[PDB]
Amino acid sequence: VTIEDALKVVLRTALVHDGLARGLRESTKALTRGEALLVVLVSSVTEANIIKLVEGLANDPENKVPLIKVADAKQLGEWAGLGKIDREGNARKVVGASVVVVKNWGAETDELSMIMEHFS
């Protein structure tokens, strides 16, 4: 089980329980309110300001929130569930997500423990 594969299930479980803040504005709002448990940020964001702000908020001394890097924004959006399912079953019309923040894990899964263990 790779780290990337672990996040596939972890984010999906959060979606099922409405525990994800999808997008920059929701992610920034969630971080400032202290409801963020994990941050997944895209490394390939064209605007350096987006990376700088989220990293600063995630590293706030009052509320330190773990941060993860993902290569592609389009690939993150599929985890966030933005895209739709085609007849073949492949994701279609997927929408990129620069940032995704988890507010509630919903269910305790071994993959969640694996993600936490790396950060500790």
Partner RNA sequence: AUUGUUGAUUUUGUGGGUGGUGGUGCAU
The residue ranges that bind another protein (CB under 8 A) are 15-18, 24-25, 28-29, 32-34, 47, 49-50, 52-53, 55-57, 59-60, 81, 84-87, 89
Q: Closer to another protein at the Cβ: 1 or 16?
A: 16
Partner whose footprint covers residue 53, from another protein, RNA, none (CB < 5 to 8 Å by kind): another protein
Angle at 81 between CA 32 and CA 105, to 5 degrees: 50
State the residues that interact with RNA by CB under 7 A: 22-23, 25-26, 29
